[PDB]
């Protein structure tokens, strides 16, 4: 696993950086950034020079980009840009030139090779400036030249994508500093060749690797006609069938998240995996904390689990027999929390309320005021109807009466901004397969650390789902208690990375745009929403089923499915409904195509239309 | 998801079918079979003709193969072989010719394309006799010829791998029947073109797809010299770094199981996924039942869970307050079952015994005879030391005294033949990341159905891990209570398929061969095994650490990891040990390489003979 990458973009061409020449509508260096992020890169250091503003503006779209300018770019070569970048590199890394177009498989190849220092090379490209590599019995670099008559053998041609350790970069930089006066325009290939004399730098030769440098006009124009369609074909060969899921459970994911599950087998006890788990714990909690909130006041505890499993974790680990829990039940998640508390014989009372209209906050405060209750359990967003409870009022108020707050945010977390501190939330549960847009398998609880340890002496009500034992064992040892869903957690790492890329606020805006399109269509058709828009989460909408016998949920479902849309049925006993969610990787235009299909069906069964009769004496 | 495939192998070229020409050491049809299985194919129908005995022998190595002979293969074309096969095809399927070598990505492409009828085509191959396809603006098939003069356009060249619906095959066979007399040597390409006039058959053109048919003498060696290395390069571009894990946890898996996680997003409530889960239950229970025992007497209940989760499911769902549970504890799994029973306040007693020596079966029988206990909970294989408890004696004996049997087989199931009926096991737990060689995430309990049903009215001790609620909800509705680990379960399906390919008996023999290599090396090194060989499972071995201060677990571990081997520490406080497992996709040659590395380290610290002056 490579976490960091360096893009060299100091040198000159146009009135443009060559990385910003556009193919298929997007600048080529931006496509390089996208492929790198797709393979799990966390930090991309771009060494800029001529026309730096372009890269500085591109960095505003990708938080992973750090632009570092080589101010002496006109008097130096690529190694100067590299040394300028090198202070920002902490680990093994990928080194790329900005003018490349390449099959992303190369990345996958370089990352999946054991050899720590590894140059990517191709077969005969019969291009213009070829960089030829000379290799030994162990396919390690022995020579490098742009003239074939200078090398004892020719193993391949330099692509411009190389995997290097921080130590190799240190040697390259030391050799560069020693020669700043004699060789001020040294290329990085030279420094790597010299470093290869004391450090084995292997070459991985992909004979038919598809790639091209876009520096000139010849390669620029031959790439659009021959090389780039080849790259697009190769990359789409790995594309997965896109199903647009309109259910609030596992939704549509990006293919990069899908492939994050594909990784080397690892023993979960190893320090690398414990590091992955610590990283996940640290990163997941920040999606539920404002920047102003100290992340150290909170912890994350993960389980191989569904979201309801994390709810059971909270309910069965946070309420001692000494206390009494008040459970708010205005939906199926709250009812499930009540049932869990009941099964465990937890001292509890239930506050039942409507599934599609807001809670009576004054009756809620009246019940808070009795001071009977030590703990409050409630739900932020009930997917049964899409009602959004005002926990920013409910939970601080419960805090005012001395209660500990336990919250289901399984279908709210990462879909909307949250700050547990100002929200007055001590324990918050969520899962990996909802608005974080990962794969199902990991449930987790973000805890106020003080409230979490006050749990330390509670008698255990269970084993696998006990919050404090799970947290403490990984605090003592760098390991989890039992085997975690390793591949699910790799996928979750990439989902977290892409959440940091998209931002929670802009993810909310995307969900809301899809919701707006759907609601506009619902209004245009005369269909009725159960929850008024003021109180709706923009994540799922419950729609009243038409009373006509011509309507069938199965018919609408199969019709939508024939066009790659998966709609969700209703769950209420009181009211016949169907549900449309818009989370996951759904795009607004996909919601409009579905909306066109929905209008087609509803008109076809007589909704929004006059019923014309054609009989006549 | 494509479950079926047809390979046409009727005509001749030598004294063997062309599919059995060998490149890279393996017959090309065997490579095709392996690539198909790797992509999740469950049934391969091979239409045979000349020298069918070769394919009949190949079917002995691959349970997925059904060989059906075109008895009139000398008087028919490829469509006759197809008609012979067509009665054995029930769903959408892949149609492949036997003399093909191809980039396996094509399979992945055809399976992941939404279009139901789909011809795979390549760019200009510049070979002999090429089949050119003429397509409309949709890229749908309108023409087919080996003369470019006859086609209004040239969209690509037919590869010989096609995805088809059962209805399209019905149309081709109907058109074939009426023309058995005039056109007895009809090719399948012709019947497909005829069906394509009334059914849209799309063409997917991978312009640079690497493939060749091995038909003449020219192409065979043009392929060994140029095409086949290209295919190998392309496929290794997708290869995952192979780490050989010697821990009993998640071990080394096949890349096919890894990539089975990559699938179209699906809502778990959809009927296709409920069918996948029903299939998983039905197939998973068979790995713990002999052929003679009725699978209807048993059920499988799955949870998003580790193995300890399944243990907790069993103990917290199978023992009522009215009864009394005896837990055998000769290892960490038994201690964990005891701890769970205690946390849930189960009326329970502990039978403690040595972690590395066999249970005293007579003292145990004496405790059974007390008639104090309604339930017995025990472990088949303790990875703490590799001790294998004689459950074939213990559990039938417990049944003889009227007890309900609860068994941890987390590290035994699918590593050795098991039959719950003759073993007297009522509830058996296991996981997805051990001997089945899948990915972690799914725990499951195989239950005697009658004993499972007497659980129906026990008060629930929990919710997520309650056995009967989980089972009943999926019995009633075709759905699970909560969101299951969908992708882990696709990986588990592929793992089940590969277990059916290998068979549990031969997997046991593979594990035991690795264990034999390791034990021979241990003996040659003078190291001591804590458990006697007759009570060892053969899946993991606990080895006493050398007394020399030159030894460090840290050093041995880093040295092994430096060569892609992951060794496991010991678990006892009483005796300092390290552990070597040999499960997962481990191959004997990899075990032999590890033994050489182990010898190197151990010699470097002095476990060789000492003779000097
Ligand atoms: Mg350049
Ligand atoms: Mg053929
Ligand atoms: Ni009328």
Numbering used by the authors:
A (entry chain C): 1 to 13, 21 to 624
B (entry chain A): 1 to 13, 21 to 620
Paper's wording?
Herein we reveal widespread occurrence of nucleotidyltransferase-encoding genes in phosphonate biosynthesis and characterize two representative enzymes as phosphonate-specific cytidylyltransferases from the Gram-positive actinobacterium A. rimae and the Gram-negative spirochete T. denticola. These enzymes efficiently activate AEP, presumably for subsequent capture by carbohydrate or lipid nucleophiles. As predicted from gene annotations, the overall structure of the enzyme included an N-terminal PntC connected to a C-terminal AEPT domain. Structure determination of PntC from T. denticola (Tde-PntC) and molecular dynamics analyses indicate that PntC selectivity for the smaller AEP substrate is primarily driven by active site steric constraints.
